[PDB]
Write an enzyme that holds these catalytic residues in place. Sequence first.
Site, PDB file in Angstrom:
ATOM      1  N   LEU A 284       0.710  -1.428   0.004  1.00 29.51           N
ATOM      2  CA  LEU A 284      -0.078   0.001   0.134  1.00 29.51           C
ATOM      3  C   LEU A 284       0.758   1.357   0.123  1.00 29.51           C
ATOM      4  CD1 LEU A 284      -2.738   1.562   0.053  1.00 29.51           C
ATOM      5  CD2 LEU A 284      -2.833   1.026   2.478  1.00 29.51           C
TER       6      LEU A 284
ATOM      7  N   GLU B 118       3.517   1.842  -1.633  1.00 30.96           N
ATOM      8  CA  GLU B 118       3.971   1.989  -2.963  1.00 30.96           C
ATOM      9  C   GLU B 118       3.003   2.692  -3.882  1.00 30.96           C
ATOM     10  OE1 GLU B 118       6.759  -0.828  -4.544  1.00 30.96           O
ATOM     11  OE2 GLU B 118       5.758  -0.839  -6.335  1.00 30.96           O
TER      12      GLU B 118
END
Lengths: 440, 61, 425
Positions: free
Chosen positions: A252, A254
């Site tokens: 998440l 990223e």
Amino acid sequence: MRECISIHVGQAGVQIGNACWELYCLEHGIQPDGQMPSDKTIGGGDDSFNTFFSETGAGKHVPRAVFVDLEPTVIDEVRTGTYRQLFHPEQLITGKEDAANNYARGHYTIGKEIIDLVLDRIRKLADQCTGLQGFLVFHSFGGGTGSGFTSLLMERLSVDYGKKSKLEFSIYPAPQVSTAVVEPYNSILTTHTTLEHSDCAFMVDNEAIYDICRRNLDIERPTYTNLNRLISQIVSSITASLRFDGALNVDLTEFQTNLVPYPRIHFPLATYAPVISAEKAYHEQLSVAEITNACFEPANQMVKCDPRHGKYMACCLLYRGDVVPKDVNAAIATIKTKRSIQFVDWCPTGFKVGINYQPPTVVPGGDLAKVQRAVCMLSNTTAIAEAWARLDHKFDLMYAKRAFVHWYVGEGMEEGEFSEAREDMAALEKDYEEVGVDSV
Amino acid sequence: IQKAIEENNNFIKMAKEKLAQKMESNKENREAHLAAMLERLQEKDKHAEEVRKNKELKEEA
Amino acid sequence: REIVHIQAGQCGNQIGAKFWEVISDEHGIDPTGSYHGDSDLQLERINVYYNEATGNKYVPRAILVDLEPGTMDSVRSGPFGQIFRPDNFVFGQSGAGNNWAKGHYTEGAELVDSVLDVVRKESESCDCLQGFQLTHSLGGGTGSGMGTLLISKIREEYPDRIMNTFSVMPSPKVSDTVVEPYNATLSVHQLVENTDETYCIDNEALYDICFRTLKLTTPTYGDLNHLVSATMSGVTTCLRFPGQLNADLRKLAVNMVPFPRLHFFMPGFAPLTSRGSLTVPELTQQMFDSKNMMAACDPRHGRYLTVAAIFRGRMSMKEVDEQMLNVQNKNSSYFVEWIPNNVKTAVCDIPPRGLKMSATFIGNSTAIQELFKRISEQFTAMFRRKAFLHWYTGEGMDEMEFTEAESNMNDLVSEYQQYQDATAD
Ligand SMILES: O=C(Cc1ccc(-c2ccc(OCCN3CCN(C(=O)CC4CC4)CC3)cc2)cn1)NCc1ccccc1
Ligand SMILES: Nc1nc2c(ncn2[C@@H]2O[C@H](COP(=O)(O)OP(=O)(O)OP(=O)(O)O)[C@@H](O)[C@H]2O)c(=O)[nH]1
Ligand SMILES: Nc1nc2c(ncn2[C@@H]2O[C@H](COP(=O)(O)OP(=O)(O)O)[C@@H](O)[C@H]2O)c(=O)[nH]1
Ligand SMILES: [Ca+2]
Ligand SMILES: [Ca+2]
Ligand SMILES: [Mg+2]
Ligand SMILES: [Mg+2]
């Protein structure tokens, strides 16, 4: 390693947390007594599901969570409910009087009486963590607790945990399904107070959820349970990258890197598909292309706004289930060639894709159908500013006459806080206007 | 690296300072409101004492 | 979640007795205090109005006050009389004789501490007290003067607790006593300042209902109190029964009062049917009908600041949403536009005794102006000639104190007009 502590504040936060933790248990094969036959690592482990669950030597899997409400009605149901065994009692914290839909009571008058204890319990949870990653805060804009106490807690957590990540799942108020007419006031106040302490916030408009439940599930009049189960599905899609892990999984953080171009522009729009009844799902297997198409139909958005009238700053697709890159890329190509996806001139137009293989489960006897695959789109778009505008309008209508303001001043607040929050909201609206302008 | 640390610490410090100021101001404001309301009720009791005193100055007539 | 009940004076004690009758019926409590209901939903929020006494008895958290002994003896004599705390009866001998000063300043002042001691005991056994409710009348002397005073002293000792009142408005149509406008104005002077919500029960509205709509050329005080008890049961329905609304009096008051002084409500009930001779649309209109209002005011002569509608009975709540949205949009001109979503609506799936479904209506309308202007008129008709002033100056009051109350009420009316004339831009 990389643990996340969920904090559920107020009635809405608590009930959404009930939905979310029940769904997490079903997803991971955890029983209501906390046992998980799957896990052979007794007492601990570095598995993915341990980012949200700690383990006891007796084999119990305990949510890394703390539920807080200023009155005990809602949390008492948890204490006596089906999942009463999961939580250590110290994780469930209650006051005696609530905030009566008053931001001042939640932030100052009643909140101060319990904030230190809540922080102590959160610290006790964090001391178990070998590499805590951040907090997930579930709350409502409109409630006195969910607004005021959430804001106070966010300030204090900023103090006690520095810039450590704090994500929000915030319930945006529906004009007609609310208990309070002063919810625009609390919404503006808490948005102003927490804006510097949140790194990312996912807004859920109860009107959008209500309309989705009515249209897609043929529910004459959705209840809090229906909305909360759908919201839990969305939260599960967002957190699956954290709780599961595989080849195609994208973490998440990223996505968060792409979704936030500036510190203040951190309010993604979430869309979810498929939302379909068991009756309609029978003999209606839904392809990757179909759910991906649904992701761009605005009637499936979590917030009522028009992306096509704004500009995209980011688009991420989080698939879970029977999905492979070939089909995803094909569907994305068709959508690109047939829809109004207008990106700001200063960021690339690519779509960021992640896929989890564990299929979505559903609460038994619920209204949502079990499906082989599903998708949640997280898009940073200027159109979400509409949600601000609408609210900022309602606020403006009352504050001109100072309607209901005496209830806040009586609890120690000043009109200056109202004006400061409103000016911050206006600056946010113009920031969203500015980001969409084209470069020279 | 030291600038990064300095900014994290600065953020924490000013978060703490502004919150402490806010809570102090709110305590002062609510205390003043209650005090005003309490003294108003007391002045009301006083008017009550005065009038009840007055009743005794007409019966002696 | 505990509320403490106080009834003062003849009217207050009598309508409070009827209220306790009705709600005890609804909660399955018999005149002795035992529970014999067939629903555990009847007891989930029983502590709101009852203490659980040794031996699984249930006792009203009620407080009976009067400067005369006849109303306590009658209250004990009547149904459910033996259920109240016998030590909660606070009595006097000398009475007040429809004099506001005697209730506020001199004799009620002597008995006020006796009443406050009982209030303190009741309060100190509350796990978390949420506020008080007072049943009383404004035209009398005890209920008027002594209740206003008792309100002030309670606010002294509970400044951060909700104080609501069911206040009965004097009307010439029911009471001969001339001086009632004086008492009503003097008590409103206090109520505007020390209450969070005042539900204006208008005896003129009650008699008009009982005559034109209930076919009673002569209605008794019991006939009016039937309506009043139905209304009070409706208004308290949300706090007394489980639903999907987490609201104490402070939450509801926050939602209903946009300006501290303008907290005088216009109650309404439906259906109002005579013993001689129902769909959600019909309930909805009947409830918004000017001829189902318990205050002698026409809502179409003013504008709603906030409205709350409580439906009782098993019904299509989808249909309730439809009909409420319908009334709002088809009467938009009568809802101020600077308070978005100012109409709230609750549903309780258990009707009151004797009806398949009812609709209680609470309204903060600037049309309440009409009621306050009525009283004021009567008031001035005497004060310009200083009629009967000796009754009050004899107790120690000054003439400019009457002037202050009259100007305060005129200011209140002028304030209701201001927000009725206000517009968004
Ligand atoms: O204020 C008083 C009298 C009083 C005043 C106001 C109200 C009131 C009624 C409704 C309301 O909003 C309605 C709530 N929505 C909540 C969830 N909904 C869903 O559909 C849930 C599902 C997801 C979709 C819709 C409904 C607010 C307030 C009630 N009562 N106090 C009583 C008293 C007075 C004096 C003395 C003693 C006691
Ligand atoms: N989606 C969803 N929203 C809820 C739920 N419960 C409350 N809300 C939201 O919260 C608002 C009302 O405030 P509450 O959450 O009930 O009150 P609170 O947060 O407990 O704080 P208090 O006002 O002091 O009671 C409404 O605008 C709703 O949108 C829920 O169960 N599900
Ligand atoms: N609705 C109703 N009103 C009453 C009743 N008894 C008295 N009143 C009203 O109260 C006024 C007189 O107050 P009263 O009840 O005698 O209180 P007291 O004078 O202080 O003892 C009159 O204007 C009546 O309208 C009753 O049983 N029902
Ligand atoms: Ca493990
Ligand atoms: Ca009579
Ligand atoms: Mg609550
Ligand atoms: Mg009497």
